[model samples]
Target: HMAYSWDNRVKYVVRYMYDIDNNGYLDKNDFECLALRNTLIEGRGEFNSDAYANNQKIMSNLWNEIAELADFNKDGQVTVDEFKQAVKNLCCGKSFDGFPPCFKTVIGRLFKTIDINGDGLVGVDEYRLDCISRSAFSSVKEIDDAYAKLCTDDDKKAGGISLNRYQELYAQFISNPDEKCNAVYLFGPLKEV
Candidate 1:
């Protein structure tokens, strides 16, 4: 049905959304929140009704993949143990470049979904929103740390990060065997990781 790779990434996502040892099962709404916020941030396009895109589809697709991975019981929701099993069973890729086929496809579609017309940019809001979708939420603190660490001042000043750059960073995330890579926190910090 879905898939997985980043172990701690999965773990943190569960607790951040559920808090069940967080016994609470993983719900589709978790992914909905991410999609919703992705459309929310400034250039990202959400609340102010600034012409949104298929982020909901993208997010839903992602959730479907995740659900397939963890919801072995086919109950539509994934328990903590189920997710934990999902992580241990298949943690994403083969190694670095060897990630999951479906996940790769998902990311491929994701970039295009960003800001297709180019009127908007995928800046700090995109990254920070991603982090929040996974955990505590943010401030200038975590946002600044991640954006400042990965991008240049000109990058921020111009039109924010490029689609190519976002892909590269996301690629780094799925590719890295360990959490030492720069992209680990691209989606925000996994304090648990």
Candidate 2:
């Protein structure tokens, strides 16, 4: 297998977790807010007081972990650069392959997010929106090349991409970055150079 650099992957991660307010940086407040929002959404929006407490606890633990890993300066905050470095270390470093430990989980979540219609599938339109239009693929030829690379004959016959196939594509990309595939693009755009 060819060694893959985490440069593009880090850019994608940063873009995915960038500041929601667009105030320019990601700090503790930003992480906390995003964590809480995700927790509530996962909890189905609301529940009894007991459930609320449980959610809070979970969110607290998650926030702590985020701070522990990403807060390099120990200032109880994480800037975008700090977060990128932390993720790079956590995901790319020490692995026999360049993929981070969180690779599978992160990619799984990405697939779900891109499956906008909740149909357990990602069609070409969804792929175009998330991977092509949203990313730096400015030409139709580039977009088509990506689509052909990621979408299998089975996917074409089935009319949509499945989660298993999506995961496999990512694995292939991580193992061999030389392939002109859109796995990184499907995840998100490259934010930094």
Candidate 3:
């Protein structure tokens, strides 16, 4: 039997968490829905607030990059298989700077979301609550375990990860999908939470 590949793991996570439509395929509209979901707003283009619009653009551009990188079939939509391949190629022993622009954009957006207090650092409660909201993780056990490995003593004392440190680890997490790392559970396991 073949062990689960990083491609499969990445596919599982994206399909479980990002596929808002349950259609089993991902496209630009899905990202738009994510914008609304993140901003906690309703009616795309109708609201058009700064936050709403920014998220809209971010998710939109994010889709563009994903499509360019992953949509090898030229179908304008990404399948779990296609996305997994994308993850593997992007990962492949990359460091933070070695990562593509897509990861940088994604991590920056995620950092802002997790740093809800606007304190330039993501505290434990802040990060945990967001993970729970995303259903990426449901309990504290995984959180504590992740923190122990990912967070430095200073970070633990500060109650979270600074963006600088978080970025490096985030790159490490994405770049080494099968490796044991703190960000391994950063987005939680490949299974549905």
Candidate 4:
């Protein structure tokens, strides 16, 4: 029923979120980076009270759950193959009220979903693709602006970006409220607050 099959989904995540060391493996550092990235609190909406505390809790729980499920073989680290196998095993034929408890929530899923290449960073190309996919942007100029706002460095030709940086931009957009172009580059549209 989903647009991408489970096999493709795992491959997509592994491609963008793992193997940052280029050692052809997904180790604890990769997972640790992901855990910290997921925990970033980047929304400054009016109703977002105690957002830091809340997201910290979410991040802590998410890390614990991921380690439990994905860190197989009792090792401190997880390989890309191991992570893929674990995801397949956990989500293959199972049903959950939402996502499996291990995944934590929709935002966690959104993080993985948005980072299409799984390279532990979100690039401008990736951001643009997601924005267009979601029909979240209206103009080419706006897309360029969003990328400029989200880029981690002054060099536009650099590599991917940290989720922390992305969320910081999103937070700025949220507080400003007129930055419509940045919405799609976010984890989701600004709805259902």
Find the candidate with the highest TM-score and give its number.
Answer: 3
TM-score of 4: 0.41
Off by over 4 Å in 1: 1-7, 14-23, 27-67, 73-75, 84-91, 95-121, 125-142, 151-160, 171-177
| Candidates' C-alpha lDDT | 0.58, 0.59, 0.70, 0.51
- Clashes (N, CA, C under 3 Å) per candidate: 13, 1, 0, 8
Q: What is the lDDT of residue 56 in candidate 1?
A: 68
Best-fitting candidate, measured by lDDT?
A: 3
lDDT of 3 by residue, 1-193 (tens): 1113454446545664568877888997789788888777334336658888888887898889889999998989998878767767886677777767775666676677678778988877776776676565556887667657667787788777888787886666545645555566565433432
Clash pairs (backbone) in predicted model 4 = 15-117, 15-118, 16-117, 16-118, 16-119, 16-120, 17-118, 17-119
Tens digit of per-residue lDDT, candidate 4, span 1-193: 1213333334434544444345655555655455444445243233343655565565556556666778878676666667666666665444333235753253345655668778767776776777675445557777767566546453345476665455444333322223333333343222221
**Model 3 poorest ten-residue lDDT run:** 1-10
Give the poorly placed runs of model 4, Cα more than 4 Å off. Answer: 1-8, 15-41, 44-50, 96-99, 104-193
Residue 88 local lDDT, model 4 = 61
List pairs with backbone clashes in candidate 2: 91-100
| Candidate 4 overall lDDT versus native | 0.51
Any idea what lDDT model 3 has? 0.70
| Cα lDDT tens digits for candidate 2, 1-193 | 1112455554444545445455655555655565556556556776355655664565456556767778788887666677667655654323323554334444665677678888888887777778653457667566556576567788889887888777666665444345345555444334453
